[PDB]
Structure formats: C-alpha cells, structure tokens
Design a protein around this ligand. Structure first.
Ligand SMILES: CCCCCCCCCCCCCCCCCC(=O)OC[C@H](COP(=O)(O)OCCN)OC(=O)CCCCCCCCCCCCCCCCC
Ligand SMILES: CCCCCCCCCCCCCCCCCC(=O)OC[C@H](COP(=O)(O)OCCN)OC(=O)CCCCCCCCCCCCCCCCC
Ligand SMILES: CCCCCCCCCCCCCCCCCC(=O)OC[C@H](COP(=O)(O)OCCN)OC(=O)CCCCCCCCCCCCCCCCC
Ligand SMILES: CCCCCCCCCCCCCCCCCCCC
Lengths: 55, 162, 101, 470, 100
C-alpha cells in the first residue's frame, strides 16, 4: 500500500496546485487589447471600491 | 454664467454619447468638435479663458483636424467592421456599460463628500498663466518642449511612406 | 458695470444674427427657384502643424507677460526657441518637409 | 522659486542630457552617421554621470517648486544613466542589422533618460506626470522601432493605447487630488486634514487612480497584462530599457511621493497596496511556470520583482531601512536585468534558442545563469541581498502575508529560473568592438552581482549615503 | 456660485464615456478618439480644480495635458496609418498574435 509513497504525493499537492493556478492565470493573457483595457478598468473599480470601503 | 456652464456640460455629454455610439467617422469627429466647443464653453464660464482659447486653437483646431485629415486619407466608408454595428449589440456593450456605471458612481460618491465653497468665476488671465509658466514651472516648459519633440520624432519615424 | 454686460449681449446677438443670417440665406437659396491613394506627407504636414502649434501656444503664453518675467524668462524662451529651431532644422534636412522628390 | 547659479549646478545631468539631445539632433541634421551619433549620445550620458560628482558636491536643495535634489535624486539619476548607456551599447550591434534609419533610436533613448532624471528629481505632481510621459512616448517609438514586424508594431500599438489610458487615469487622479488639497507639492497632499480625517473620499479616489496608472507603469496586478507581449515584441535593447530604467524611475518617484505625502501613511492605501503586492508576487510567479519565451518569462519576473519592491515600499513609515532596502534591491535588479537582457540582445544582434548556449557562447551562458540565480535570490548574488532586505523590512512592520507571499513566489520563481539555468547547459541542434563592449557590460554586471553578493557592504554604504530631506 | 462638485461630475461622466468608447469599439480610430476624450476629461477636471482654488496651476497642467494629448494622438495616428498600410484593415482584434 505504501510503495507509491503517499506522503510524497501529499507534499506534491502544492506543486500541482501551482501548475493548475498558473494555467488558469494564463487565460487572462489572450492577447486582446480591448480585454486589457477592460481589465484595467476592472482593476480601477476594484481598487476604488476597496479604498472607499476601507476609508 | 452658471446657465451657460450647465448647458455646455449637457451639450458635451450628449455629443460624447453620440461619438461613442456612432458609425460614421466624419460624423463622430464632428460631434467630438461640438463636444470640444462645449468644453471650451465650460472653460470660459469658470474664468479659465486661456484654457478655452487653447481648447479651440489646438484641441478643436489642430488635433481633431489631424483626425479628420487621416480619416479622409484612409477613405473610411462602407467597411465590413463598420456595417455590422457590433458595438450596438446589447450583449457586447452591457458589460462595459455597467462597468463604467460602477466606476462613475464610485467616483461620484467620492466627489460628493468633499468641501465646496463654489467657484467664483474670477477670470484667471493668460498673463498670470504665462507668469507662472516661466516662473515656478520653467523646467516643465523646457521638458514639455522636449516631450513634443520626442512625439514629433516618433510620429515621423512611424509615419513615413518610403 | 453695465458696459461689460452690454458688450456680452452685443457679442451674443452678433453670434446669433450671423449664424441665423447664414441659415436663412441657405433656406432662401433652397426655397426659391424651380427645379427640373493619398501619401503620408499630408499626415506629416498636419502632425508638424500640431506639434509646432503646441510649442506656439507655449510662446503665446510667454509673449503676453514678457516684461515681468524678466531676463530669466528671456533666456528660458531662448532655450525653448533654440530647441524649436533645432527640431525644425532637423526636420528640414532629412526631407520630412520636402514635398518634391 | 527662481533659479540661482547653484540651482543650475544642481541640475547638471538634466542640462547635459538635454544639450546632448540638441547636439545629436543637429548632428543628424548635418549627416546621418550611426557611429558618431551613438558616440555623442554615450558621451553626453557619461558626462552627466561624471557631473553627478559636482551635484554631490553642491548638496541637497530644492530647484523650483517642481524639483528637489537629494541623495536618491543622485542615486536614481545614476541608475537611469547606467541603464541608458547599457541600452545604447546593446542597441548599436542590433542597429547594424537595421536597413532603415538608426539615429533616432539614441535620440529617443536620451529623451527617455531625461524623463528618468526628471522622475529621479521630481518633487511635484507636474514633474512626476511630465517624467512619466517623457519615459512613455520615446518608449512608444522604441518598442515600435521595427514597425514592419507584426510583433513590434502590435506591441507598440498595445503599449501606446494602454499607456494613454493609464496617463488619463493618472491625470484624473491628480485632478481629484488637487481638487481636494489645493496644492500639487508632495508634502501638502493631505496637509489640510487632521484629527484622523486622512481618509478623505476624494483624496483616496484620486490616489487610487494614480495607483492604477503607476501600477500599469510598474506592471502591478491587475494592470500587468501588457507586460509579456510588450516585452516580447519590442527590440531587446528596448526591452532592457523598459525592464530597468522605466521601472527604476517610476518606482523612485513612487517611493518619494509615498514618503513625502502625509496621505502616504493612510491605512486604506496601505491595505490596497498590500493586496496589490500579494497579487503581483503570486501572479507574476504563477504565469511563468510554462513559458518557452524568455522575454515573456522576464516580463512576469519583472511583475514579481516589482511586487517585492512594493512589499518593501508598504513598510516605509513603520520601518526605518525600507528606503535603503528599496535602493539596494533596485541596484541589484538593475544589474541582473541588464545582464539577462544584454545576453538576450547579443543573441538578438544583429537584426535580421537559449538551450545549449554554453557550447557556442560559454561566457554569455555563464553570465546568464549567474543573473538567473541572482533573480532567484540565491546567495552569493546581489538579488539575494535585495530579497534579504525585503524580508527584513517585512519582519519590521509584521507584514506576514506579504512575507509568506515572498517565500512561495521565491520558490516558484526559483523553479523556473533553475529551468532556464540548466537548460543553458544541455545539448540542442559580432566581430566588432561594440559587440565586445556589450559583452564586457554584461560580464561586468555579472562580476558586480557576484562580488556585491559576497561583499555587499560597499553598495549598502553607498545607498545609506542617499538620505533625503527629513 | 458654481460648485466644484458639478464640474467634477461632468469631467467624470466624460471620462467614463471615453473609457466605454475605448472598450466597446474594436476600430482603432474610435479607440484613439476615446483616449482623447478621457485625457480631455481629466484636463477639464484639472481646470475645474484650478478655478476652484483661484490658481493658474490648473491651466498650466492643462497646457501640459494638451501637449501630451497632441503628441500621443500624433503617435497613435502614425501607428494607425502603419496598421492600415500593412494590414489594410483597422480591426484591433487582428493584432493578437502575441498571447500566453
Ligand atoms: C438657448 C437654449 C439652448 C439652444 C441650443 C444650444 C445653443 C448653444 C448653447 C451654448 C452656448 C451659449 C450658452 C449661453 C451663454 C449666455 C451668455 C452668458 O451666460 O453670459 C454670462 C457670462 C459672461 O461672462 P462673465 O464676464 O463671466 O460674466 C458673468 C456675469 N457677471 O458668460 C460666461 O462667463 C461664459 C459664456 C459661455 C462661454 C462662451 C461661449 C461658448 C459657446 C460654445 C458653443 C458650443 C457649441 C454649441 C452647439 C449647439 C448645437 C448643438
Ligand atoms: C567613457 C567615460 C566613462 C567615465 C566613467 C563612467 C563610470 C563611473 C561613473 C562615476 C559616477 C560618480 C558619481 C559620484 C556620486 C557621489 C558624489 C559625491 O561626492 O557625493 C558626496 C555626497 C555626500 O558627501 P558630503 O560632502 O558629505 O555631502 C554633504 C553636503 N550636504 O554623497 C551624496 O550626496 C550621495 C552619494 C551617492 C549617490 C549615488 C551614487 C551615484 C550613482 C551610483 C549608481 C551605481 C550604484 C551601484 C554600483 C556600486 C559599485 C560599488
Ligand atoms: C511541512 C509543511 C509546512 C512547511 C513547508 C516549507 C516549504 C518547504 C518544504 C515543502 C516543499 C514542497 C515542494 C513541492 C514541489 C517540489 C518541486 C517539484 O515537484 O517540481 C517538479 C514539478 C514538475 O514535475 P512534473 O510532474 O514533471 O510536471 C510537469 C511540468 N511540465 O514542478 C511543479 O509542479 C511546479 C513547481 C512550482 C514551485 C514549487 C512549489 C512551491 C509551492 C510553495 C511551497 C511553500 C510551502 C507551501 C505550503 C506547504 C504545505 C503546508
Ligand atoms: C500563499 C501565501 C501564504 C502566506 C501565509 C501568511 C500567514 C500570516 C498569518 C498572520 C497571523 C497574524 C495574527 C495576529
């Protein structure tokens, strides 16, 4: 039962989590300029609203 | 003074709405010129006479002249990207509309809580702006000349025909 | 001061009567009578006009208040005009302002 | 404030660089000579670098309401000057492969360096805005220098549109901040508020719009999506310039603005910057696991390293050595990025795969893996000294989320940096003194990073000599 | 007699209209048009802020703003001319060859 080293897999969990999160984050870099401007405006709203709720 | 301010602001907002929702480049640029004349009216109603003068001289007299120039050079007419009216499909613009709406209302709510004694409309003359430009702000003048020269060089290098 | 508001009203009726006179002139012309690739040098010229018009507006702001700016303002605008003339000479020499081939 | 002769003495790099632009432009007007104009540009930049000694002898003083010359004014001016000189040195053999006009490149580099010196000495919203625009517009020209390429033209279009949007955002921010404050001086941004009313809605809104514009300028999340495409499409000397000089100057003026403004120690801005720093570190490390492109990889690397610098900036008021940490990190990051992008430029020169680089270009491969180890925070490198400084400043103000983000981002960045560093040594299927000069520049950067990793005391003392007006 | 708030709201409305026109339009000319709308809106806000305090610094930064707007419009229209010269179309979605 142990010959596959289960603890090594339990500590290899964050590696596969990092790869999945990186592949998910790479979906934003689609190469479209209109999406880049939209993301800049989205971040503007997020930063602005975070500043007013924590003011 | 105030009535001119509100009328020119309403004209500028309506003209900008017409620009961002039009299909003809020449009509859009004409509506933008109307908006710039209205914004110069806003400038003159607050006392910033030099600001409105430069708005009609170099913004509504040079830059949009260049836009109209490149529009008539490119022969923009019944193109494929223009005929489809993709920017008028509600599924396209509904996201950016509510995005600009939440940005606008956050900015509005931040603005509305500020102190305000009102703008007296005292005319800040162009002489005072010239005094300050060559007074405290001299390096701004020299390096803005350098900035315009850099833009000149860049736009020449990109825009050659060869 | 009734003179200032009088001049404002005079400007208002001057604007209105001029625009309306042109409007009714076009209207009367329509009403009466029976019936039965461009090169990039254009862009370069317009671009040079825009850039030198902004530098011109800087000189416009200078020239109205020359006396109280002193000699320091004069040497500042001397560097400004020298930069403008250097850029103009640079544009002339390379062939940017040469329309003929 | 008027101008005195000693105030002119304090502005030697600015006047020398502007005179260099005038002289090089008049020389191009005389005759298009690549070697002569490049030599004139590097002579002017070196003259500014030498005249920094006379500025140091002059002392710290305020020139106009716009500008203030002090220790970091000299430090960031010098860093921008080395970045511009290295950019010209890398650009010359690359420009030997250019069929079209080459002399405007050095003009744009000089003007962008002039904007960098502006941002170094800025003490005002006007000087900050003008320096940002003076960096951006020559970068618009330089990114799209080879506009016949799809990649360079597309990167120039993207950078131009997005930076105009960010400039309008930033200008609206200064407009709101000036409406609240009534003064554009750095020390007065929040001087009209007291008794715990620092969180003014309009002041926070304007400063948030400035954060939007500057986080575009510093590739901070979520204003970061332009970075890999612009880094990949631009010419490699240009990519070196946006990696080093623009980031250094914009972060220096950001550091001075947050130190001098009474609103810089607001809790809401601190929390927003902490969120942005966390997100930038994590994201800029996470999108770079699976990049086969070295330039996009270095763009995400720049995102993560600017997140680390933001982490150093957040503890400015609480900590005491936060600004010293920022200076040391920026020097080490400058040298590492200079070496890495110089190797990229040398394999990109002249104009017309890093795997197996050691078997034909061993010195370039060795300095490349040295700079990749530097960017990972590996010891015997200056990047480790910068990461140690950032960690120490994090434990100063107890920014434990940021410290843990630094650790995990360091691990992920270290993973892909080792991938590149060992792929250099695997197996896979010039001839002028300026190419040798660029190789000498990247080699000197490698020896500097190694020596100042083993012996970091001279750089620490140099940075500690850079103290502001309290 | 004219509130600072009302001019700030007008400038913000113009700014968000220019941003919306920048986002929803995939023709490059209308994106540049939106960029000039936003930079003119920020310049209008700066003029309103300067006129509220009775200082010429608002008009000075307006002058700097329109200098930037002129040079940036020149650069953007040169890039638009290059795009229309080499690709014969102004689709901003066509420039997407760099991704990932
Ligand atoms: C009539 C209903 C509407 C009809 C359709 C729209 C027509 C155009 C409306 C806009 C232009 C006119 C606005 C009304 C101006 C009336 C005059 C006025 O308000 O004068 C007061 C003041 C005089 O100057 P001041 O020294 O400040 O005096 C303060 C008094 N102690 O004035 C000021 O301080 C500033 C005055 C305004 C600025 C100068 C003029 C700007 C004109 C901009 C035109 C833009 C394009 C309009 C296109 C319309 C069609 C689409
Ligand atoms: C082809 C031709 C080639 C020519 C050679 C090119 C390469 C060499 C370039 C040399 C540049 C020299 C710059 C000298 C800067 C320091 C000048 C100086 O004397 O500063 C003294 C001053 C403090 O002195 P003090 O008189 O006490 O001041 C109190 C008065 N109020 O100190 C200060 O106020 C601050 C001093 C530090 C400011 C920053 C230092 C300059 C920038 C360094 C960037 C690189 C740093 C990383 C590398 C370090 C390597 C060890
Ligand atoms: C006792 C627990 C608490 C204390 C923890 C202290 C930290 C140190 C000890 C734990 C270290 C765990 C490291 C796990 C990953 C090890 C590296 C590895 O496996 O790399 C190889 C792997 C790719 O291998 P392959 O399967 O071939 O993937 C195909 C890729 N094209 O590569 C990948 O999949 C990508 C690797 C990315 C970088 C490594 C992952 C770093 C994640 C953060 C680590 C920090 C601790 C997080 C919390 C731990 C649990 C509490
Ligand atoms: C992925 C990054 C994880 C970082 C974890 C940091 C945890 C910090 C906890 C601080 C608790 C303070 C309590 C007072």
């Amino acid at each position: 039962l142990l010959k596959r080293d289960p603890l090594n897999s339990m500590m290899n969990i964050p590696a596969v989590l990092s790869r999945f999160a990186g592949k998910g984050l790479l979906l934003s870099e689609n190469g479209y300029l209109r999406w880049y401007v939209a993301s800049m405006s989205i971040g503007a709203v997020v930063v602005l609203a975070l500043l007013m709720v924590l003011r | 003074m105030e009535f001119a301010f509100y009328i020119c602001g309403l004209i500028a907002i309506l003209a900008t709405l017409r620009v961002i929702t039009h299909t003809n480049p020449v009509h859009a640029l004409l509506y933008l010129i109307i908006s710039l004349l209205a914004i110069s009216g806003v400038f003159f109603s607050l006392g910033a006479y030099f600001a409105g003068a430069l708005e009609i001289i170099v913004y509504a007299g040079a830059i949009m002249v260049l836009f109209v120039f490149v529009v008539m050079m490119l022969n923009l007419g019944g193109s494929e990207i223009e005929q489809e009216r993709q920017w008028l499909k509600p599924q396209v613009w509904i996201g950016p509309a509510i995005l600009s709406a939440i940005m606008l209302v956050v900015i509005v709510y931040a603005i509305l809580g500020v102190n305000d004694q009102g703008i007296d409309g005292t005319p800040i003359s162009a002489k005072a702006v010239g005094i300050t430009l060559f007074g405290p702000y001299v390096l701004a003048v020299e390096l803005a000349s350098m900035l315009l020269l850099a833009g000149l060089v860049v736009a020449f290098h990109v825009g050659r025909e060869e | 001061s009734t003179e200032v508001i009088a001049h404002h009203w005079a400007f208002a009726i001057f604007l209105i009567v001029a625009i309306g006179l042109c409007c009714l002139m076009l209207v009367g012309g329509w009403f009466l009578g029976g019936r039965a690739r461009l090169s990039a040098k254009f862009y370069l010229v317009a671009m040079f006009f825009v850039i030198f018009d902004v530098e011109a507006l800087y000189l416009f702001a200078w020239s109205t208040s020359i006396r109280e700016s002193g000699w320091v303002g004069f040497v500042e605008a001397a560097i400004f005009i020298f930069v403008l003339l250097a850029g103009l000479v640079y544009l002339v020499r390379i062939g940017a302002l040469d329309w003929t081939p | 404030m008027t101008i005195t002769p000693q105030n002119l003495i304090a502005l030697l790099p600015l006047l020398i660089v502007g005179l260099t632009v005038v002289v090089v432009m008049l020389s191009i007007a005389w005759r298009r000579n690549h070697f002569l104009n490049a030599t004139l540009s590097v002579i002017g930049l070196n003259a500014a670098l030498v005249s920094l000694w006379f500025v140091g002898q002059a002392g710290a003083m305020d020139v106009t309401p716009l500008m203030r010359v002090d220790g970091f004014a000299m430090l960031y001016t010098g860093l921008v000057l080395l970045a511009s000189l290295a950019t010209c040195t890398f650009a010359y053999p690359w420009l030997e492969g250019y069929n079209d006009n080459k002399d405007e490149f050095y003009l744009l580099v000089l003007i962008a360096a002039l904007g960098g010196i502006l941002l170094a000495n800025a003490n005002h919203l006007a000087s900050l805005f003008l320096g940002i625009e003076l960096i951006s517009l020559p970068l618009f020209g330089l990114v799209g220098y080879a506009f016949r390429q799809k990649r360079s033209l597309e990167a120039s279009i993207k950078y131009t549109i997005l930076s105009a949007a960010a400039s309008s955002f930033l200008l609206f921010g200064m407009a709101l901040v000036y409406a609240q404050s009534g003064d554009l001086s750095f020390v007065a941004l929040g001087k009209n508020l007291g008794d715990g009313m620092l969180n003014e809605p309009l002041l926070l809104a304007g400063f948030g719009l400035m954060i939007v514009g500057l986080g575009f300028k510093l590739s901070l999340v979520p204003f970061h999506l332009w970075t890999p495409d612009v880094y990949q499409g631009a010419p490699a000397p240009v990519s070196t310039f946006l990696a080093t000089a623009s980031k250094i100057a914009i972060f220096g003026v950001v550091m001075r603005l947050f130190l001098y403004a009474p609103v810089g120690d607001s809790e809401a801005i601190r929390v927003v910057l902490a969120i942005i720093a966390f997100a930038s570190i994590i994201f800029g490390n996470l999108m770079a696991l699976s990049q086969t492109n070295i330039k996009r990889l270095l763009g995400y690397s720049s995102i993560s390293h600017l997140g680390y610098l933001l982490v150093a900036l957040i503890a400015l008021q609480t900590g005491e050595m936060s600004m010293e940490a920022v200076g040391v990190y920026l020097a080490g990051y400058l040298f590492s990025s200079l070496g890495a992008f110089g190797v990229v430029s040398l394999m990109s020169s002249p104009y017309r795969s890093y795997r197996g680089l050691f078997w034909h270009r061993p010195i370039l491969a060795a300095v490349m893996t040295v700079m990749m180890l530097s960017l990972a925070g590996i010891p015997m490198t200056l990047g480790f000294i910068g990461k140690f400084y950032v960690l120490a400043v994090g434990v100063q103000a107890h920014l434990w989320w940021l410290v843990g983000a630094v650790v995990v981002g360091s691990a992920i960045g270290l993973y892909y940096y080792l991938r590149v560093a060992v792929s250099l040594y695997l197996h896979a299927p010039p001839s002028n003194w300026q190419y040798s000069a660029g190789g000498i520049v990247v080699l000197i950067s490698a020896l500097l990073v190694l020596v100042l990793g083993v012996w970091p005391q001279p750089l620490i003392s140099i940075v500690r000599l850079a103290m502001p007006l309290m | 007699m004219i509130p600072l708030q009302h001019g700030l709201i007008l400038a913000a409305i113009l700014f968000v209209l220019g941003l919306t026109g920048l986002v929803i339009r995939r023709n490059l000319l209308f994106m540049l048009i939106g960029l000039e709308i936003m930079i003119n809106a920020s310049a209008l806000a700066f003029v309103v802020a300067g006129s509220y305090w009775g200082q010429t610094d608002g008009q000075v930064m307006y002058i700097l703003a329109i200098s930037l707007a002129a040079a940036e419009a020149s650069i953007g229209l040169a890039l638009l001319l290059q795009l229309h010269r080499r690709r014969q179309n102004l689709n901003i979605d066509s420039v997407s060859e760099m991704r990932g």
